[PDB]
Design a protein around this nucleic acid. Structure first.
Ligand SMILES: Nc1ncnc2c1ncn2[C@@H]1O[C@H](COP(=O)(O)OP(=O)(O)NP(=O)(O)O)[C@@H](O)[C@H]1O
Ligand SMILES: [Mg+2]
Lengths: 457, 49, 98, 44, 49, 98
DNA sequence: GGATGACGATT
DNA sequence: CGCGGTAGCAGTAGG
DNA sequence: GGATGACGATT
DNA sequence: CGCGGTAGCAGTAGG
């Protein structure tokens, strides 16, 4: 984790091209390789992917080449029919064009083995200039799609691609390697090594019973858990889309782990903690595949697709929860883990605080000896109008005492709650109190006199 | 420890229903009540026997 | 052996406990009745009101709702108010003269 | 077939097809909401 | 386990029945077998208990 | 009662999800409190524990605001572009502490 | 420049 | 087996 | 059907 | 003034 300063827009248009290459693995499972070449010096970025490419063919309705149609015109996508439940990232048909629009230069190059042709077309000046595509014969070669763009840095308020934006883009490439299944990603001709989402989650090991708890719940859900240091943290992926703000999916997972834990902590011992205290001691990693997802914006940072529309469910097992309970998170929650129930010793007068609050009398006693005597006296003077509470010891001199020291003294507070006492205004009548009379029972020794003095004070 | 012994004595003295059919020592003070099974009792410096 | 306290009906929907099984402390039955009065996270309240009137003897005055009267009749007065305690002579161990 | 897979829609058509990014989900949603209770004259 | 397994109470009854007075650990050995420590010293404690 | 809650308004827009403005306010109240709790006694609590015991009402006017979507549920306009600042006074914090 | 704490016989 | 709370005064030390 | 707790002399 | 921890056994009660 490093403090950085980046232009989100720039980072996003780069994400739009990555997510497009990752979508192609869903399209053609035979894909194996994705290249990401950042030439910082030339402010140029290249994203190449093998497998099936872009059909080089004239669209029967738009009367232009398909590449020119889906990369040069807004609102163009293959994800417009929702009858077919797809797990692609593409949903709205903006992201290619949104990269083009932000770019001083944008070039599409694709090889179609069906027509045996190579297709290259260049846009310039924020997709306002559209050069005719150069089409050549392409025989005995692999099909591929290569997107190369030069960001309009002047619009992003940057003179060059500084270390901060670079460091982030690179980490977004490691994301793809981890979130996508059965592919090999290369950063400037260098293999990224990681092979599955577990390999990915373990990259955070050194920053973070083990330290990382991973599992695969099913064909569409992968969950990892670690104990957070300061507050709740999440790194999730919906169809290889970095959902950095979370959403319905994240909550769907966390709402379980928090629910089940709370029952376990509560069941074993009383006083179980508030939900937020459990959640904010978690680090949650999520890699899932949602059918035709929906987001808050085109950036797709926050999923909103209701759980019942996920196209699959993820039931967090009990075994998983019992392992989380083996980490520091548990020992953490254990650390946090009219009548009056607040004070056991208190023999509350039957009528106390009631319409006869003024009649009843509370008897404060010096020590449990005096207390025992008083409670014995109840058996003679009746409970209805008489209670008793034992003063611990020498009472706290309230004057020349900090408000905090007074607030902290459980003994004065107990008194204030039993008598129904507040400082506000000037006391005119007892009427507002639980008790209307206060009786002092001290051993009749000098120290007793002192106690009386402290009470009066 | 003298504490345990003091408690032994208090136990020998307790006179609340359900304690000693015949208390060999007299509970001259708050030697506990039936309210908590003698646990209420007061400290040794208090009660006599 | 079994050891019974004493519960008696002193009015319409009103019970009175005058005795508890020996060694059954007053604070235990007190907490029990308080729980029955103010309900609980795991159990619903079944007592309408409760008052203590102990002299040199045990007095618990309890007021239930008629429903709880029938229900308690089904459960058994002494069985529901914890007024039954077992005494076991099966474990009588001591050092013989030797 | 390659002309049925790739579609181009108008802005008015995208709004009615994918309302979420414009006005929010058109599906019913379980929520915890504040309401005005005319009977008690207060939020609840 | 004979000594600290709650499940073995009777086992300990018999265990105490077995012990022979005068059976104490060698004052000068500088090597204490655990079994012996349990059958020569801890057992004394139990008896006292 | 249970966790952090917020009811904010950016130019009469119900920003139900919060954003930069809400955080701008809460990040202060949480910061100043933490120093006060920490300064007086050792061991002051994690930020989230303070925040999740607050209910915050906000009614503000931001110059040419920017949101996450057309629905405008979440403000993203950086604090330095607010067109105005809100410095939470110490007197306010000392009342929250009451 | 105000606050907190040490010391000691007693609760 | 062990830990904790309070009064009362004079002066020192800590932020 | 396994767990927790009461009781009491001692750490 | 006051609070808390542990052993050791038999059986009862609570979920
Ligand atoms: N490298 C590629 N290989 C195959 N098809 C592609 C590739 N890049 C883009 N496309 C297609 O071109 C269309 C437009 O891309 P795009 O503008 O990103 O829309 P989208 O990804 O489907 N929706 P969104 O992700 O929200 O922007 C998509 O439907 C893709 O199917
Ligand atoms: Mg895309």
């Amino acid at each position: 984790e490093k403090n950085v300063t980046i232009v989100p827009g720039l980072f996003k248009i780069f994400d739009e091209i990555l997510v497009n290459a990752a979508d192609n693995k869903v399209r053609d499972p035979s894909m194996k390789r994705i290249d990401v070449n950042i030439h910082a010096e030339e402010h140029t970025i290249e994203v190449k992917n093998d497998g099936k490419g872009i059909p080089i063919e004239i669209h029967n309705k738009e009367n232009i080449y398909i590449p020119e149609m889906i990369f040069g015109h807004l609102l163009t996508s293959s994800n417009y029919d929702d009858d077919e439940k797809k797990v692609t990232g593409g949903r709205n048909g903006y992201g290619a064009k949104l990269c083009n629009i932000f770019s001083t230069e944008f070039i599409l190059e694709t090889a179609d083995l069906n027509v045996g042709q190579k297709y290259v077309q260049k846009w310039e000046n924020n997709m306002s200039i559209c050069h005719p595509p150069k089409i050549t014969s392409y025989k005995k070669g692999p099909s591929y799609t290569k997107v190369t763009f030069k960001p309009d840095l002047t619009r992003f308020g940057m003179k060059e691609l500084d270390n901060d934006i670079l460091g982030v883009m690179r980490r977004r490439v490691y994301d793809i390697n981890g979130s996508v299944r059965d592919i090999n990603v290369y950063l400037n001709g260098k293999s990224l090594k990681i092979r599955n989402f577990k390999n990915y989650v373990e990259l955070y090991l050194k920053s973070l019973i083990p330290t990382i708890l991973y599992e695969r719940i099913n064909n569409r859900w992968e969950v990892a858990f670690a104990v957070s240091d300061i507050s709740f943290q999440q790194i999730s992926f919906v169809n290889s889309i970095a959902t950095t703000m979370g959403g319905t999916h994240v909550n769907y997972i966390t709402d379980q782990i928090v629910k089940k834990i709370s029952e376990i902590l509560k069941k074993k011992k009383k006083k179980s903690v508030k939900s937020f205290q459990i959640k904010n001691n978690m680090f949650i990693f999520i890699n899932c595949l949602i059918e035709n997802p929906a987001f808050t914006s085109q950036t797709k940072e926050q999923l909103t697709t209701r759980v019942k529309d996920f196209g699959s469910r993820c039931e967090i097992p009990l075994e998983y929860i019992n392992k989380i309970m083996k980490t520091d998170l548990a020992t953490r929650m254990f650390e946090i883990a009219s009548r009056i129930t607040n004070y056991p010793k208190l023999e509350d007068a039957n009528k106390a605080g009631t319409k006869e609050g003024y009649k009843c009398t509370l008897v404060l006693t010096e020590g449990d000896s005096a207390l025992s005597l008083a409670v014995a006296g109840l058996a003679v003077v009746g409970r209805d109008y008489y209670g008793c509470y034992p003063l611990r010891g020498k009472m706290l001199n309230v004057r020349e005492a900090s408000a905090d020291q007074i607030l902290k003294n459980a003994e004065i507070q107990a008194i204030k709650k039993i008598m129904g006492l507040q400082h506000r205004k000037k006391y005119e009548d007892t009427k507002s109190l639980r008790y209307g009379h206060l009786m002092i029972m001290t051993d009749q020794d000098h120290d007793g006199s002192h106690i009386k003095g402290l009470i009066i004070n | 420890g003298e504490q345990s012994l003091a408690q032994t004595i208090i136990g020998l003295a307790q006179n609340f229903v359900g304690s000693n059919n015949i208390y060999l020592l007299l509970p001259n003070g708050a030697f506990g009540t039936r309210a908590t099974g003698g646990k209420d009792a007061a400290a040794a410096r208090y009660i006599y026997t | 052996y079994r050891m019974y306290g004493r519960i008696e009906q002193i009015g319409d929907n009103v019970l009175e406990i005058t005795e508890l099984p020996a060694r059954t402390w007053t604070s235990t039955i007190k907490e029990y009745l308080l729980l029955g009065l103010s309900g609980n996270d795991k159990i619903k309240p079944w007592i309408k009101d409760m008052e203590e009137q102990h002299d040199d003897n045990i007095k618990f005055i309890i007021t239930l709702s008629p429903e709880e009267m029938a229900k308690t009749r089904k459960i058994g007065f002494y069985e529901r108010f914890k007024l039954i305690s077992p005494i076991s002579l099966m474990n009588m161990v001591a050092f013989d003269p030797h | 077939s390659a002309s049925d897979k790739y579609q181009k829609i108008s802005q008015l058509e995208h709004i009615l097809k994918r309302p979420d990014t414009y006005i929010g989900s058109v599906e019913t949603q379980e929520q915890l909401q504040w309401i005005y209770d005319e009977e008690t004259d207060c939020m609840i | 386990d004979l000594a600290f397994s709650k499940k073995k109470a009777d086992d300990r009854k018999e265990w105490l029945r077995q012990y022979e007075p005068g059976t104490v650990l060698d004052p000068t050995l500088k090597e204490i077998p655990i079994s012996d420590f349990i059958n020569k010293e801890l057992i004394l404690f139990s008896l006292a208990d």
